[PDB]
Structure formats: C-alpha cells, structure tokens
Request: fold
Amino acid sequence: PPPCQGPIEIKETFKYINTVVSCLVFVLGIIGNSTLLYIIYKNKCMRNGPNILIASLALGDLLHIVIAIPINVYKLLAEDWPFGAEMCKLVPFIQKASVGITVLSLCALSIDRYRAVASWSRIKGIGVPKWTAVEIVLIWVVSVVLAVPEAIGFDIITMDYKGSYLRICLLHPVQKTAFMQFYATAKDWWLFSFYFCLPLAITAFFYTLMTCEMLRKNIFEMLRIDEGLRLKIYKDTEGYYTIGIGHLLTKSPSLNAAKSELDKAIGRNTNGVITKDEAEKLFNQDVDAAVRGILRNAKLKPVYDSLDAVRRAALINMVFQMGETGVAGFTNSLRMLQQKRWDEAAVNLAKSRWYNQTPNRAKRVITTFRTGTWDAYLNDHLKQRREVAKTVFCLVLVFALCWLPLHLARILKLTLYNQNDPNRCELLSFLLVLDYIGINMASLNSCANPIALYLVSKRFKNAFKSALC
Amino acid sequence: DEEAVYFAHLDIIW
Ligand SMILES: CCCCCCCC/C=C\CCCCCCCC(=O)OC[C@H](O)CO
Ligand SMILES: CCCCCCCC/C=C\CCCCCCCC(=O)OC[C@H](O)CO
Ligand SMILES: CCCCCCCC/C=C\CCCCCCCC(=O)OC[C@H](O)CO
Reply:
C-alpha cells in the first residue's frame, strides 16, 4: 500500500544488450539441438538406450528454446500481450512440459548409466533396451500432466495502472477451485523443489552409486594386472590350492577337498573352473575383508582414512601382495603418505626390496601413490567407464549452472519482497533483469548440451564434425 | 498488490 520513489522499469540500454544475447542463444540452440538429434538419427552406432534418453533431453530443450526466447524477447521489447487467452494458457503449459521432459530424461539417464556398470555389454551402450520406448512415453506423459495446472490457471487481466490500459497474461490471483487457488501460492516452490532440487538430488545420488561401482572395477583391473587372474585351481608358491586373484582355498593337499571349498565359496559346482565374474565377486569380498583388517590395524588405519579412493587402492594392492604386517613395516613411507608427501614417498618406496624383486608392479603402485590417478593401469574397459562418467557429469553440471540464475531470481523474490516498504518497488527493477537473464541462461542449456557431448565423447566429436562438413 | 501485477506485466513468462 505505501507509495514508491520510482516506477518499476528497465533501462533501454539493458533491453538492447539482452536482446542481442537472446538472439545468439536462440540461433546456437536451434542449430546445436537439431544437429545433435540429426547425428543420433543418422549414425547407427549412436542408436542406443543412453543416446535415446539424450535425444529426449534434446527435444525437450529444442521445445523449450522455441516457446521461451521468442516470446520473452517480444515481451521485453513490445511490453504487451497481443495473442489472446489461448496462447496465454498454451505457452506456459508447453514451457513447463518441455522443462519436465529434460529433468526426467536427465534423471532417467543417470539411473540407466548406474545400472549399466555391472555389465560390460550395457556400459558400451549397444542396442536399445526393451522398456526404453515405454519409459520415454511415461516421461513425456508425466511431464505434460504436471504442466496442466499451468494451462488452466493462466488468463488475461485487463487493469488500470496509473491511467494506462494493460493486457496482462499472468496466473490469475483468484481461482475458482480450491486446489488451483493453492497452486498459485507455492508455484515458485514447486518449480524450485521439483524442477531443480529433485533432479539434482536424484542425479547426484545415482551418479555417486555409479562411480562407486566403477571404483570396484578399477581395483579389480588393477589387481588383475599386478597379481594375475587364474580361473582354474592352481598351487601357489607354497603348494596351497588357490583360485582367482590370490584367493587361498585350503591348506589341504587334497585337490578334491580344495574343489569343495571352491564350490562353497562360489555357490556353484565349478569342477575347478570359475568365470571372470565369479573371480570378481570373490575378489570384491576379499577387498572388503582386506579393508576390515586395515581399519582394525592401528598402523594402517590412519594412513588409509586420510588417503583418497585411488591411493587407498594402491595401499590395498600392497596388502594383497605382502599382507598387513609387511605393509606396516614401511613405517616412514606410510607417514609420508598420510602427510600427503607423494613424491618423497614415491622416492622412498623405490629403495625397497619390494621394488627390487617385483619392479614392474612396484612402479605401477608407486605411480598411483605419486599421481593419485589410474594412469598406470589405463586399459580398454576403464576408458569406457571413464567416458560414461564424464558424459553424465557434464550434462547435470550444465543443467545446474544454466537453471541456477532463473531459479535463484525466483527464490529471492519470495523471501525479500515486502509490499509494505516504500523502496521495495525498485528492487523488482533488479529482479526484472535477473528474470530475463535467467531466461537466456536456462535456454543456454539447449546449446551447452551438444558442446558438452562434443568435448567428452570422442564419437560425438567425430559425428558432430561429420554433420558440419 | 497492484505494483506486483505491473511487475508480472514487465516480467518474463515463468
Ligand atoms: C544427495 C541426495 C540424497 C538422495 C535424495 C534423492 C534421491 C532419491 C532416490 C530415490 C527416490 C527416487 C526414485 C526414482 C526412481 C527409482 C528407479 C529405480 O529404483 O531404479 C532401479 C535400480 O535398480 C535401483 O538400484
Ligand atoms: C615443463 C614441463 C612440466 C614441468 C612441471 C613438472 C610436472 C609437475 C608434476 C608433479 C608436481 C609435483 C609436486 C606435487 C604437487 C602436490 C604436492 C605434494 O604434496 O606432492 C609432492 C610430495 O609432497 C613430495 O613429498
Ligand atoms: C604428476 C601428476 C601428479 C598428479 C596428477 C593429477 C592430474 C590429473 C590427471 C589425470 C586424472 C584423470 C581423471 C580423468 C577423468 C576420470 C574421472 C571421470 O571420468 O569423472 C568425470 C569428471 O569429473 C569430468 O570432469
């Protein structure tokens, strides 16, 4: 009710700069999303489950960029709504529909890639799964159903603002039904909770579970290269029957007794021969047993707790080769690892009999300590898992950054606007420029998805060059 | 809240 020291306005200087920016986002978004959908359709090596979910993300962005920028550019320059009450209900409906398509396709992509880690065939993304089709139709149907309240609640207001005639397309303050009257109150929170907080929380959860399983496969490949994988029963250096990656079966001289120990451990009648997946499951149990002993060891626990995941694997590698006691004897090098003194620890470890007796394995483990990367064990499967993890990480990072300003501009309008203040009117003039910048940013997601795929996927980088040649 | 409906007149559609 109290008056204000100025009229809510935007500088014409701003209107001309932002419009130029909005023109670039629109042209690059249409080209990037169309070519992205083109290379996924043309190339047959890219016609798989994960890319189909990317195409659903690309269409939702291509749909959003079409109904968001061209109408908010006009709303900026012309400052009026001349499209009738049908477009006033249709435009925000298609908008919230397209946005819901992208956040659910993102969520489905993170879930799909997490389930694919367990199988080498799935993480390569070969073929189209069965329920891929029915999942997309559910994503699009649920997206438009949740966008329905946006359609019915919008209408054209005709009011008098200081003697000026205004056609205002907006969400009507008073609604007939009681549910819709409630939707108009907390709509900005529903947009903030469901179209930003929930997809970021869901993707971050399944991405974390994915890389945790990727970590277990890195260690298995590390120990297979260093120690060796034996899929048939063999005798170790002491004559004891062993299988897999150094897994002792029994100290009995009876091969037949050792075979029954194997059958108990695998849950299968193996006749002395196991599969790689069974050796891996057996190895993952040996790691968990090894970690439990490390955490119960007073000399290895502080070092292990302070190390990152890659370097913890290098320490587990040493325990597999020498045992807890033999590793705890490296009292000085372990101290340097806990103080994060890599290069010094790398130099010190190279003086050991361990380095002198098995130099190839020792060099790899020391490099892992020095660098903290898997560069010493880079192999075919690690690269595939590395490319997958990069793909979904950038797509969710592009999403969170592009939709943060628009979502930020709406959540500070809810908590800082107080209609009783005399000077509150001109902070909306600052929210006016934020809400229009947030429209260019959210539309940049349509353009930044192809750029992200070009940089992290070698196949997308080559397919993009092919389409623009 | 008439300064608010004028805000929605200048604001984007979201
Ligand atoms: C840091 C945030 C903490 C986490 C808070 C947000 C995450 C909520 C997780 C699940 C609820 C939503 C479930 C969506 C559909 C799940 C589909 C599914 O369960 O996938 C099968 C797969 O095998 C499963 O391992
Ligand atoms: C001109 C060509 C490139 C020349 C550039 C050389 C390459 C740098 C590589 C590693 C940095 C080594 C320092 C590691 C930084 C992390 C700090 C650390 O603690 O590691 C050292 C360790 O502490 C010791 O005790
Ligand atoms: C002398 C060197 C001393 C220290 C050397 C450190 C330099 C980092 C080098 C390789 C890290 C390999 C990481 C490659 C990406 C694997 C992780 C991944 O794929 O995750 C997605 C990523 O977050 C997308 O940004």
In short: Chain A has two domains: 12-211+390-467, 215-377. The domain at 215-377 of chain A is CATH 1.10.530.40 (Lysozyme).
